[model samples]
Target: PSMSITRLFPALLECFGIVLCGAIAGRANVITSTQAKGLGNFVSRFALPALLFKNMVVLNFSNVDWSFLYSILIAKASVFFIVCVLTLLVASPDSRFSKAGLFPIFATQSNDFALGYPIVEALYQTTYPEYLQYIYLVAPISLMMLNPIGFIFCEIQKWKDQNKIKIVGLGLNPIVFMVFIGIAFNFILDRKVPVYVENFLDGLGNSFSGSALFYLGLTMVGKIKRLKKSAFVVLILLITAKLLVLPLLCREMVELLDVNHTSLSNYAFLYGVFPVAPGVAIFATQFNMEVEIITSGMVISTFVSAPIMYVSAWLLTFPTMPKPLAYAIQNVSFDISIVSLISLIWSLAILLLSKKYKQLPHMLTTNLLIAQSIVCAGMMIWNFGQILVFVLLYSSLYSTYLWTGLLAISLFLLKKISGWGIPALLVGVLLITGIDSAFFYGKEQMITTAVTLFCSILIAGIQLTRHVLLCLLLIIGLFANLSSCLWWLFNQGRLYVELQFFCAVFNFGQGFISFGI
Candidate 1:
């Protein structure tokens, strides 16, 4: 049966809200171009590895679904091969489209780590938790097979000079490396991680979604501004193929291959809903090949995919459809309206303020970060405080004291470690709210917020000592309460989720823009 539109509405709204925070931060000059690069690198290198490790270590490989695995692998290979061949055919020695062949690799690759799991979780909320394991299975598949081959195609021109061994090794970055390490530990002694270590890893993993999304938004800011008309055409074509054509084709392939599990079949289709992987941009930049087109494609596809995802989910999960595309269009339209209305007044205020100060630099024209911080603190006091009282019904002094201690320490450090003074204090308030939400609300309720705070703190800490590695690990503890928050939110009210979601999003803007500034 098709889920009601209202059922999926919150997830769609939350996803875009997170992205919007990044976009707003970008415009506010909070997240500069250099920080954006660092955020992306940190996400890919640290957060992604931690997420993959946490998911893989607990998975039971002996009982894996081989049919489901083969179906997805084969389907992906066929798409990669066909697209590569077609791209090659169109390329001549002098053709500007020489690098066009690489499009298919990224076009087919999904944002499996960032946008992928949250979406699958929201869509399958009604399903059994065990079924969600299939979602984790795709992580290894992507890190191992899907992307390694993409690297090969992307660097086809340099294939001769490229160290074939190193290129193959590129596929086994920290993410894949950790996957296999976890698998080894699981298989060898049927090993179990110590309680403290597992909790540590969980904290790191929890930050993946927010950091990845925020980083993605920062990257999109500049790329979207520079997008050209011809690039727009390419973007549309690639999006059509990625969002529409790929899923339909994969669904039919899954059926033909007789991948009988409904969960697996659903997975195959929904996988295509993701935007182009950010790695594609990395490749384009590294190789100096079609850099603008590749970057634009990645950003535009991500912006467009939110709506396309609803369409993909509707068609895949629903038993019947009445003009699913049109329904999706309406859904996207409504979602954008709500988001716009939510911040409409603030936007207008910022614009008017900026115009009034035309003599100042663009960055100084308006203080959106200050406005965001004020609004965020006000919301926590007004709205979240009610939820805090509700938590008192189920809380003890120990929990309250712990919360107070955490907030106090964070505030003290924000002042001592950073020189922003008052602005730093305001950002500290935002982070305290996030930490509180992560503790009381559960990971599901506060994952997005926790991640935003985690990234901002890490970025700020990086400036203090340039110890990116240590900061990444330390930030995980900040979200340690995340796992605890998930169930609390589930049994609590939907209002908690909505409130917590809003709090997290506000922090995303605060953390990225304010801390970034």
Candidate 2:
């Protein structure tokens, strides 16, 4: 019952439906750019602020847990400061403060209301409704602690460049100010807002979710034009921060501080996976910073979140997985290699039979088949007093990683960069990895191959991003190779064979999974 996709779907559909409608209207020129700006103003000014005030006033103070709260707080702050410090160190001084200021916000902020509420509601509304109050508390932490830092740094540049910026603009802002007043009023008035005013706030709060998402699609129609499609590194970094790193941080902190609270910890991790709040994009557009990347990050992260979120759910169960049983699962190493051979030949057959094997992506596909055959088939048939086969096994394994890396690189570049066709890159990859296999061996070879495959991840991931399933599979392949690389290093020269099971579990049949791609 926990975190079911069926339960999660309707909420996404409703939100995405509005986004679809908004995008459609924009395509037809129904919503003018002027009108889109007005909606942005509405979301930033009226809708979100109204929602925050009510959520703050209803603080179930007696139900709060400081340890759990502090864990989330510290994890979030750690990421915030880390991103800020890195940005300041590297970014040029003129743009430094804003990038340092805002990038952390992108790294740390969550889509708490529109996306998160529905998600948590679907997940825990019935099972742990009372415990769900923790979700609301996260808002105050970000609004009070996180947003202030982002706002100050973002505005400092404006004054230095144009005029000190505005204390009126940052501190007296509607969303932050509303949360401040609500907390002050909550403590002062004993949580008893006038019933009439509560109803008014309720009315506005309900509109915020749908309108915010509609506003999201509204901006989506135009903002993507600013996408430095070539800004692949930054795009991947932003999405990884929001979807993967945040949740892992939350899970680690929650487990350390609140050991027995499984329910709360699961919710914390899932909440951490919530995509970048639409508000970040709202704020960026309002502030006139880099709107396109923020918009693109939100759009990309929304779909990617589901795949990583499921892995996160799976993550929580690892602590309970019996170690030897997990090992037993990896026991069938050769069996896995054999299954891979079947699929590898099947995939190769399709490529040759269809005669599209010489095409852009499939040409790269044939390269993968040749490399895989050297490993899987060579393992099956012994020859030449077995020494040449031994070399083939090692060299071809390295080539498998190399060609896989190039496959992604060439596939993406084939369409994106447009100048260098697949054949040019194809020759380059085959030459490099080909020479690479002949020259490199042992642990150093593993390191080189691992890094090579890692490059393919973001390259191909960005290319296939809109095809969510394919992209998700590609992410698994990326991580699988990395973890397997770690194990290969660990067990390579050891006598005990301790890591072999885990290595096989991750590494074997690695290319058979690529059949879909």
Candidate 3:
């Protein structure tokens, strides 16, 4: 439906624009390998660290959902362990990629800061504005865990022949250092940074996404020919995991936990599907691992995440489908069970073939042809499942119209050319938001959803006007930033102002329209 298509268009457009701009520049030699390296260093050392710090320093510990947090940590950590252990089972000690420990990092890490935040900011503005903060919550936790694991593995491989112990301090790692320091200040001291200081950090953090993406484009420019067939297969597998399996894993955990808050569950799954992080490539570079594979993976995943984000976002709205629809899909136990088994079999086949072909470049790359076959088969089954779900849900036009009506009205409101009017749209908005919120939660849901939708509509309205409205949006955005700072100044630090600013400026109205409220 156009709901998914329209929801994903803005994010894809922005991602394509940034990456294409960088790629065109790279093709023209405006940015080369040397320049890319320098830019990467700047982002890694300064921009990302600042971003991490800002996200963490303002964290509100009160009313934190420990169960949700635990679910995320457990699900992600299990995935990391599963990826690493399975890779190890087929691993060869001689291959540079395996021996230097790039496989696990590639498998587990995601580009949360670079690619993830931008896409989530765009997609979740309307559907789940709170998702932006949830990402920050997930970010430091994953980074703190994943970085240490990568560092230890790489270092262990480097010192495998030696018996002496080697030590590394968290302070020596910029990302880790920023995270811990921010945590200490926020949790222990219960403090907030000065307004100017926070603004400065925001500026530095804002530079990261575009710069990282451009560097990725530059790196990909002269390296396309270097990828072997096996490398391409492995890359596909990694992308599949990032864009598909990981989210599935997260969803499974969320359902198993039976979390009371559906948005939390949805956000966790959405966060899981983000592309491989820029840090994985940086880690490969530092350890002299298969930097080419890691870099190529980053470039490919970032570009392709457009569609993946849409599907992930699209699938997430399924719970909001009518009760009979949700139940009937759930009742298709036979097909779901069969596909589940096939998924297991495909995964195992990849492992078994990898072991049989372990003498190749790396055990991981041994079953390139078979892996592709499994990918194809899995995709067919997945397509069938999605179509089945779609058909079953079509029984009720209520859910369909509920979602599409919002889309149509938002488009018309944004002056994108549609037939809907303001009054009808407003009623639709209130009906959906009121029903979803009250059914989902109590008064809090109503208020949260109402505020979020209000911001979303405001942004859409502003976009339909000319320069004056643009200037007004800028002014409001500026005021939001100042408000955020003011809240911090009084030690009443909250994420609300920043959230509104992100919706208005970063995602524009695209994210707003899709918001669940």
Candidate 4:
């Protein structure tokens, strides 16, 4: 809520700490899985419901954009069907229906109580606390729409012989019942619950966050150990769907639907980022289907989700980036020298594949890659870590400018100028910059600054008239460096971490992009 990004780190540490204590306790057998279920029961049935009710009651209904809610429903309903159809397509016929049932649950259910709530509260508790309602709102959709369809599939598979199936009351969970009651009470009390009800709700709701987190810790205890070899790929696909696929669809809906709020898009994307609900495992065991797969996805994600959410948050907001962004950017910049080595390998691949290494464009690109590789390696070693390598980075970076200018000149030559004289002159600039760079290393950055900024636009400007695919590629490179060059021009230090992120994606794929060209 409009606070320093660093504040999120300290808040997260305590939440993770509480959860880990429970995890550690569960590991030691001080809290068993059976005991963990009881904790889930309280957190799910009592404490979480209370918190949900309170939030619903206190919500400013008018300011709430119902379209965002509609967007969420559309996003999930589509994902639920997609996973159901995919499971049927992939699984064995005998297991197909049941897998269809369970996998969709895997795709749609989220650990709102344990993870989403705590993180949402931490992010918005000071201001913009309405996000909590959307988290609550998310519950009924899964419990009702998503879970019910999966249940229908499970029941159909199980009751094939007997031909009996249960009704749908199970999806209307206790928490959902609280939602109905909470809204009813909100209207009846005219946005003011009686003191007695408020006290009761507040008292129980206060206990939800810590206990729910502890329950999450307990849930993670043995799932990984139970991860059967057969279930490994299942778990992988499950999380792949849960973590990667689900958030993707939601954000696309937010974009396509043109939801007109920043936090709306944030909620649309990040809301789906919560871990799998423990209930998936509970129901899996109840139905005798995909128990290990569900549990494995749940626990693995419990560990992974927080960091994912942490990264997702700052990434989505990186222009307005937070502390976690700072840490991740700085950390990657320091640790990711392997990318340069990888880039060199990619460069070799590009050269070998192309029949045109003898050509002007190819030569300019090859030299540029060499310079770029040394700079990443040298910076990692020198300014942060040696002398020769660091200077190597600078001088080679000077070569990078020469190559870029040549690349630009070549673009002009082939399209408009058609002169061997200018191409020869551009190659001379390279030799000169490289020679002058070795001993004359003082104001070396100005050329780099000018070149990365000016040549970037020129290259992008030239390529925009080419084929559509390369135009997109050129534009992408523009974004990665545009921010980098923009703020690198605007005075540096600020937004440096964000620059590192966008820049790395561009450079590390240097070989791949060159080959594509």
Query: Which wins on TM-score, candidate 1 or candidate 4?
Result: 4
Instruction: Write one digit per residue (lDDT tens) for candidate 2, span 458-477.
Output: 55565233223433454575
Global fold similarity of model 1 (TM-score)? 0.59
Candidate 2 lowest-lDDT run of ten: 417-426
Across 361-448, the per-residue lDDT of candidate 1 in tens digits comes to: 2222123333333333333342224655433222221121222223334434545612122233333344347524334444433444
State residue 154's C-alpha deviation in candidate 1, in Å: 4.6
lDDT of 2: 0.64
Q: Please state the error at residue 91 of candidate 4 in Å.
A: 1.2
lDDT of 4: 0.64
Model 3: how far is 382 from its true place, Å? 29
Model 1 off-target regions past 4 Å?
A: 1-7, 31-42, 94-101, 159-172, 189-191, 225-230, 259-266, 316-517
Residue runs of model 3 more than 4 Å from their true location after superposition: 1-7, 32-42, 95-100, 126-129, 161-164, 167-172, 188-191, 226-229, 258-260, 318-517
